[PDB]
Structures are given as C-alpha cells and as structure tokens.
Amino acid sequence: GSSGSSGQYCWQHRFPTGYFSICDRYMNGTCPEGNSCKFAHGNAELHEWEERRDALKMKLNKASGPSSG
Ligand SMILES: [Zn+2]
C-alpha cells in the first residue's frame, strides 16, 4: 500500500561464504555452525545468497588460475 507497493524488499540474512547449496544439518532441524555456516539455512535464505554473492562479481572475475592442488 504505502512506502511503494513493489518498491519494498525485505531480504536481510547471513552472507554466502561462497557455497551454493543447502545445509543438511539445518534442513534436518538444527545446525552446528549457525550463522558462520558455509551452507544455506532454508530454501528461502539460499535464494538471497545467490544474489548477495552475485553482487561481488560486479568487480571480481572468474579467470584467476588453475590452482590444481
Ligand atoms: Zn549449517
């Protein structure tokens, strides 16, 4: 209604350490890590993560190196 109908998004969660998957522990019920976890904590959360990280690439690039062990 007010403050913009569509111009209002509420997505504030942890940052995706860098992984793009769901946390089995969290999905099961409880997770050991918690906030400093590398996995996602809820289908919804993941969605946001994919973005949060997609923001870094704004300046970062893929071509970095082989890093073959
Ligand atoms: Zn976790």
Side-chain angles (χ1 to χ4, degrees):
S2 298
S3 278
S5 180
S6 177
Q8 187 210 343
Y9 210 123
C10 312
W11 68 304
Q12 296 270 121
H13 299 243
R14 314 303 190 165
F15 191 111
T17 62
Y19 291 67
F20 170 53
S21 212
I22 290 296
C23 182
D24 274 318
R25 301 92 153 70
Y26 173 80
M27 270 293 113
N28 270 243
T30 185
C31 157
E33 296 292 66
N35 76 91
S36 276
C37 195
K38 70 163 166 294
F39 284 133
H41 279 201
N43 38 60
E45 200 180 289
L46 179 74
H47 312 160
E48 286 66 274
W49 270 22
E50 280 291 83
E51 301 290 283
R52 280 173 148 65
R53 197 166 162 286
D54 210 58
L56 304 182
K57 90 177 193 309
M58 79 165 81
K59 60 159 187 172
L60 308 176
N61 80 321
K62 210 165 273 209
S64 56
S67 301
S68 183

